[PDB]
Design a protein around this ligand. Structure first.
Ligand code: NI
Length: 156
């Protein structure tokens, strides 16, 4: 997959937007599927890329929530840029994924990663999309971006 090239660039720029859209990061006090990422770290390349597309798309979907962000002072244009940077890389990777054999059973990584993002959305709702609920989500997304970059490195 050609599109795993220069991925560090996506990582750097996206983490930059994530950092600049708001205040300093909150402490990580929310669940994160490190278990899953460990598994992905040593999975085959086809699975790694499929996993990157799945996760990118989940992050885009989570963050595309201007209608629920009154409680944060984040710069919305920076949010939009964040969405866009990740959507473009994701759309490139989807090209490689189209080439892969679409397998026997739903992969456990797709199930688990969805399950995690579900949890995050649930948390935001329970907390009525408060500033600290959003700041947890933001801190969590930082962690995904850091681990995704490792997977991309190892994948290439
Ligand atoms: Ni989603």
């Amino acid at each position: 997959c050609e599109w795993l090239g220069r991925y560090r660039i996506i990582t750097t720029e996206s983490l930059n937007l994530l950092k600049n859209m708001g205040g300093k990061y909150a402490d990580l006090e929310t669940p994160f599927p490190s278990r899953l990422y460990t598994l992905m770290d040593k999975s085959k390349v086809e699975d790694q890329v499929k996993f990157l597309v799945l996760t990118l798309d989940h992050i885009i979907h989570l963050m595309d929530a201007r209608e629920h962000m009154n409680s944060v002072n984040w710069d919305q244009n920076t949010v939009e840029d964040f969405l866009n940077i990740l959507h473009r890389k994701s759309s490139d990777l989807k090209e490689c994924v189209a080439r892969y054999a679409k397998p026997a059973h739903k992969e456990s990584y797709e199930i688990r990663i969805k399950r995690h993002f579900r949890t995050l959305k649930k948390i935001l709702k329970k907390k009525q999309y408060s500033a600290e609920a959003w700041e947890q989500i933001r801190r969590v997304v930082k962690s995904h971006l850091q681990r995704m970059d490792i997977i991309a490195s190892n994948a290439r």
